[PDB]
């Protein structure tokens, strides 16, 4: 009876592909053929934040667009003051293999994790003057790839294994487990309405989940290799992905299909980070060849290059007010552009 | 220029920088090694001996040993999945990679060695190759119950290298088999890289006690070779 279901699954799958085809009538490129081009965009580095012993993997802007936190493989977390380049805190880690970082929206907590299979949470506004560990979430069997804060008590993480999970910090237990992926999940992205979140795994597929229902809602497949990062959209009705086949693609939650692809012949390396501008007109992507291109999200035309790093770019972020974009790399330097 | 509170903020920042420097001295004085290998190998026993001689789903294990006033950190994954395509990029700055092989299903070990050697992010990393469980191989080839030619048809058409230094009490058959396996492993390493990194084969047993000394000597050789190449005299 194994085959009997397979046939149903194949026929059923087609019933979906046809439906998607039908629902498509025009291309986004044709619709935007009339609007004027965005023109050349020039950005120059304004700050250079140094002090990390080894390569850095992740960073996250604060809610006020003033503070930021970065994680490095030497086993340190550093909270920076972006304006004055000062250093606020320096947190040593139990395990030196860290892959992700997250800043709480309230500014009270910070989180990190990696190959140790543990999601640690640190208290910043403690009674005394030293940052201390407040909770250690241990329910995963792979490695932590990403983590995001919903509130001061809810956090969602993605692991090396297929499963994703939602935690309750007070109890330190799992309340919902998301399953359905085939490869390891690498990136994560929350919706602005904090009701849904997308996922990216190493099987060229992205899934849309419902936080309250705890069940997969939609699945998107348009890539050829593993997906590294997914940066959603300001509107929340679309999202972009970066994969290893040197492409970026824009999807939509409503029409449930691909819209446009951002690729160039001269680009061969993979993509490690994706983010959007404040208005959503600009798409910023990091690359393995030490560079960081800027794409017109409505025309798929390059509009600038953020050169200046010596090693590969590993993280990228944009402030809430959209005043600056910070870029990290494997040479242990952080830079801020305008 | 700066307010009273601003000056105190800068003073705290400069005090943090001083702590970072102090930690950098320790970070530069330690060498990190990654220990790979299959389940059938003796990698578990090797780390057990070093630890003795000197937490349920943890994804990595650490052991610290000291040889001649110098320190080493050795990591081995414990709870990751079979996939290794993604988490292998973290170890792109270690001093060396220790590869353990049960030479006593030998093809997939060669495939793993080939994949590790040719990785883009694992270039410029030397490999210390341990051919573990040699007594078992000696007692197995001597019995004659199983012949190596089936799996490897080219073994019959092969001779012991002239530079080989066999043990004075060992049969030449075990020497021929051992050096055939070693040459098969070295063929992959001697086909690419071209001076960026090298391999250091060894003939060891799981119960041996000189493994730490061998690792120390190989690390010293690697660092010395890097220094000589840097100053334009090698």
């Amino acid at each position: 009876e194994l085959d009997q279901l397979r046939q149903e699954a194949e026929q059923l799958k087609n019933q979906i592909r046809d439906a998607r085809k039908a629902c498509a009538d025009a291309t986004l490129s044709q619709i935007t053929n009339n609007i004027d081009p965005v023109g050349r965009i020039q950005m120059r580095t304004r700050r250079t934040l140094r002090g990390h012993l080894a390569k850095i993997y992740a960073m996250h802007w604060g809610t006020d667009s003033r503070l930021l936190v970065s994680a490095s493989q030497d086993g340190k977390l550093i909270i920076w003051d972006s304006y004055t380049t000062n250093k606020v805190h320096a947190i040593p880690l139990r395990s030196s293999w860290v892959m992700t970082c997250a800043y709480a929206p309230s500014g009270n907590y910070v989180a990190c994790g990696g190959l140790d299979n543990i999601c640690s949470i640190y208290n910043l506004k403690t009674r005394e003057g030293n940052v201390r560990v407040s909770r250690e979430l241990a329910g995963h069997t792979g490695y932590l790839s990403c983590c995001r804060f919903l509130d001061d008590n809810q956090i969602v993480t993605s692991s090396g294994d297929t499963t994703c999970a939602l935690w309750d910090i007070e109890t330190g237990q799992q309340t919902t487990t998301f399953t359905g992926h085939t490869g390891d999940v690498m990136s994560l992205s929350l919706a602005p309405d904090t009701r849904l979140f997308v996922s990216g795994a190493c099987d060229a597929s992205a899934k849309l989940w419902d936080v309250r229902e705890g069940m997969c809602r939609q699945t998107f497949t348009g890539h050829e290799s593993d997906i590294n990062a997914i940066c959603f959209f300001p509107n929340g009705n679309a999202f972009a992905t970066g994969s290893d086949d040197a492409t970026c693609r824009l999807f939509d939650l409503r029409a449930d299909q691909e819209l446009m692809t951002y690729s160039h012949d001269n680009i061969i390396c993979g993509i490690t980070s994706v983010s959007f501008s404040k208005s959503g007109r600009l798409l910023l992507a990091g690359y393995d060849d030490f560079n960081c291109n800027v794409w017109d999200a409505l025309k798929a035309d390059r509009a600038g290059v953020l050169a200046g790093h010596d090693n590969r770019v590993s993280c990228l972020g944009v402030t809430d007010d959209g005043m600056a974009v910070a870029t990290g790399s494997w040479d242990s330097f952080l830079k801020i552009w305008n | 220029t700066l307010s009273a509170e601003d000056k105190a903020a800068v003073e705290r920042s400069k005090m943090i920088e001083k702590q970072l420097q102090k930690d950098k001295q320790v970070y530069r004085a330690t060498h990190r090694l990654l220990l790979l290998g299959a389940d059938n190998s003796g990698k578990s026993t090797i780390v057990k001996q070093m630890r003795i001689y000197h937490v349920k789903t943890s994804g990595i294990f650490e052991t610290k040993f000291q040889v001649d006033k110098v320190n080493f950190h050795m990591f081995d994954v414990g709870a990751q999945r079979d996939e290794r395509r993604k988490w292998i990029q973290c170890f792109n700055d270690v001093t060396a990679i220790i590869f353990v092989v049960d030479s006593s299903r030998l093809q997939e070990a060669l495939n793993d060695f080939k994949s590790i050697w040719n990785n883009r992010w694992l270039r410029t990393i030397s490999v210390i190759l341990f051919l573990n469980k040699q007594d078992l191989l000696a007692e197995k080839v001597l019995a004659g119950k199983s012949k190596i030619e089936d799996y490897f048809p080219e073994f019959a058409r092969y001779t012991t290298p002239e530079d080989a230094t066999p043990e004075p009490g060992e049969d030449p058959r075990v020497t021929r088999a051992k050096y055939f396996i070693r040459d098969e492993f070295l063929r992959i390493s001697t086909a690419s890289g071209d001076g960026r990194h090298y391999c250091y084969p060894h003939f060891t047993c799981s119960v041996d006690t000189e493994n730490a000394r061998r690792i120390f000597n190989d690390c010293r050789d690697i660092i010395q070779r890097m220094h000589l190449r840097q100053y334009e005299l090698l």
Partner: nanobody
Framework: QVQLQESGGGLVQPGGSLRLSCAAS????????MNWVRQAPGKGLEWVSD????????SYTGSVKGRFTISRDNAKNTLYLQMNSLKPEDTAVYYC?????????????????????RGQGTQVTVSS
């Protein structure tokens, strides 16, 4: 999406010959390196052969060397494997696998327990 479909399976008497074809779609076949793997009954996955994206570098395992021939055709989006002089031993299920990233000399995790870019499979048995 990326999908690989097998073909050419059947039962053959010992000493016979067979041809296996793998059909690929959803990705640029010319930029990737292709492999052949098999899974013997009661045994794990075992690598068999692979061919570079240009057809220059061909590798074989020791057991089947001198018997099997591997070839690829970029025009028709198809991978070939010819088998000659079969023995009762090699009666495993055969898969066609693709290396994860393009323009890369090597590839990891091809013979993993679960792999995203592996084919459905083909059953071939040799018996009298």
């Amino acid at each position: 999406q990326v999908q690989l479909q097998e073909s050419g399976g059947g039962l053959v008497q010992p000493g016979g010959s067979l041809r296996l074809s793998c059909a690929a779609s959803g990705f640029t076949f010319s930029n990737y390196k292709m492999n052949w793997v098999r899974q013997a009954p009661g045994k794990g996955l075992e690598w068999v052969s692979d061919i570079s994206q240009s057809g220059a570098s061909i590798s074989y395992t020791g057991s089947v060397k001198g018997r099997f021939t591997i070839s690829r055709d970029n025009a028709k989006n198809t991978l070939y494997l010819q088998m000659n002089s079969l023995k009762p031993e090699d009666t495993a299920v055969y898969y066609c696998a693709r290396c994860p990233a393009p323009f890369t000399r090597d590839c990891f995790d091809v013979t993993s327990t679960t792999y995203a870019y592996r084919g459905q499979g083909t059953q071939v048995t040799v018996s009298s």
